[PDB]
Amino acid sequence: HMKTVLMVAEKPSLAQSIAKILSRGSLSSHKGLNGACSVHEYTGTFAGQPVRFKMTSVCGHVMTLDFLGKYNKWDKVDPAELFSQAPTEKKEANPKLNMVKFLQVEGRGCDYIVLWLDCDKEGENICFEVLDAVLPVMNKAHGGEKTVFRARFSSITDTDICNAMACLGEPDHNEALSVDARQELDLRIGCAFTRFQTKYFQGKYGDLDSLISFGPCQTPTLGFCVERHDKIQSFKPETYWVLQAKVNTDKDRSLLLDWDRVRVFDREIAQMFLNMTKLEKEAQVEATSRKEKAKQRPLALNTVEMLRVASSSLGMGPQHAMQTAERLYTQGYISYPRTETTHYPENFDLKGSLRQQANHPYWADTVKRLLAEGINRPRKGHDAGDHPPITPMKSATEAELGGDAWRLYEYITRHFIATVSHDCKYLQSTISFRIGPELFTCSGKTVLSPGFTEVMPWQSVPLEESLPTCQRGDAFPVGEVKMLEKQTNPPDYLTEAELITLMEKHGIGTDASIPVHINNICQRNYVTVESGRRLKPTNLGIVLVHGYYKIDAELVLPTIRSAVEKQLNLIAQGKADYRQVLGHTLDVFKRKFHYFVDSIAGMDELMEVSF
Amino acid sequence: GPGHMAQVAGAALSQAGWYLSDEGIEACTSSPDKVNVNDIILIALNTDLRTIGKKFLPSDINSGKVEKLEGPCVLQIQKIRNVAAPKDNEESQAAPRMLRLQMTDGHISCTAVEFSYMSKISLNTPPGTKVKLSGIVDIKNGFLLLNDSNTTVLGGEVEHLIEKW
Ligand SMILES: [Mg+2]
């Protein structure tokens, strides 16, 4: 009999697109039991044998981890037992979809299984979820001989999906254990500390309702925003003085000159410089220079940069941007948007990707010229060995794509074209003026070739009126000498972009989990989003961070969180032990938990004052 | 020349810019019979100029009426700050300093600014350090204008220096 091969993707839409590619359009589709998921069937060849292919999908994570029974209630103390004593089991992430039964059913007469789940670690974790359901019901293996395979791919394109099939590998079980470990750590510590506080504060304060929570990652994230707040509140502005002079050119222009000394913080010394310059009527050219310098094209686009730009420029929250990008990836418009890599592999077909955009009105002429002239090599970046940079894989118009989806897509495409374009070359000109004893300079930039700044106009060199041409020894009439009195300014609240950078620097929120944590502290109302996507700490958010710090600074500082995640990654590489990392970490936090509870007074007092 | 030798020592000192009182000079000798200007200078460098120095500066040097100072003269540094740059931030790069120095001859205090870049001094220069001014120093609005050409660091240290006794 003809063998049947089951293939499983992460989402219904992914399964359909992949199947269209592999079947060369020879597809037969029928509805699954749940209505949401479809089944795609066709005949083909596998391992030099005629087989039936059966492609379907799940709907994201099949399971979520929860306790078995009674530990699920909030009123049920002791919360401290959730660290070591409480047993764990996998529960269906969405019971209404009845995902487990469906997998068992389609998986029962199948002989081989090929995993087509997304190739970040999350997709890999679901692989063994899928295998756990399907493996016990599969056809027995004679040798046994390999019957389980795993496809690796970074984009939903004909080239990448077909190539994946030709070189199938295996699922990484070491890496899989790390996700389980990550799930267990955040839940236990999170629920223990949270449920404790919800009861402790239950009905305690009139202005206090269930909004209180703690998280091993979400709390250090909030810590950053509150840290910025504290520096802002204690900032003390200082008055300083800047001397500036104006000179009239031969073309009747007001040239503004910059003080070489830039600024001064002494009132009397400020007056001194002004007195010795205010009566001077002539400014003498002491030096001139022209230097050709280059403003480099950007590094290849990474996940962190996408979220920052989406926030700063497109007004999209980190979570909002991620879901938009994943949908774009789903529809095959971009490569997988979860990668830390900023370096194109030598093998990567840059020209292939570039041709799809050669017909869009906004950048058609730029792309066409580059394919004839020949593409430039992208700057060498860092190769993390996970995926390529986020690159467009298919053409689109503003007609096909919706509001938010188009705006994000437009940037990703424009960014890519710049990385493969030429650098921007410009002239940096300067003139040095002497007024009395004091030195002044004026600077100006003139664009020679726009380069990538043509397709990225927001990074363009600002248009300035050309500097008057002159020689050493020339003199210009001083039109005005005034001294401006100003005050140094305090920092503003953290932008979403600044928070992302902070998290990246300190090594927390890895594997693209950064947008999840940021969205978390907003939903829990620990910060508010103000104009310019600024993160303003709420009353509750401030007290909590201050409270945590007084008891144990290590609860807020990213130091501890950074090390656990580094340990988890070592597990993933097989250079550390799953059980040993769990045991050591849980011991550390159980000790910290008991100390926290004892020193709870540190938190209660601030709550009384505020509420 | 029983103490005539002590007199000529004072004259040699002033030619070098050191303005010490007669009592201060005796204090820096090791014997009354064998005055050595070299030993006196060495000791004075490590002594508070308010203790052994004699006033040379005009009483009104800070008022602005005085526009020039003629060297040579040895002074003591009382305090240094970045006057170009803000108090809390201090050092960070996009400023040029621009140091302000409060100085004294032991009797009159004055204020100097680093008009041109003096690599020989920094924010970390210890209070009590002595400097020799030479040539003509311009004084604008009461501030001495110092540069590499008119200022020489002589060294010396004074521990636990109190700005105002
Ligand atoms: Mg996923």
Residue numbers in the entry:
A (entry chain A): 0 to 208, 210 to 611
B (entry chain B): -3 to 161
Mind quoting what the paper says about this structure?
Topoisomerase III (TOP3) is a member of the type IA topoisomerase family, which functions mainly in relaxing the supercoiled DNA and in resolving recombination intermediates during meiosis and DNA repair. TOP3β is an atypical topoisomerase that can recognize both DNA and RNA as the substrates12132223242526. Eukaryotic TOP3α and β are unique in that they interact with their specific auxiliary factors, RMI1 and TDRD3, respectively, and coexist with them in the cell. We determined the crystal structures of human TOP3β TOPO domain, TDRD3 DUF1767 and OB domains (DUF–OB) and their complex at 3.44 Å, 1.62 Å and 3.6 Å resolutions, respectively.
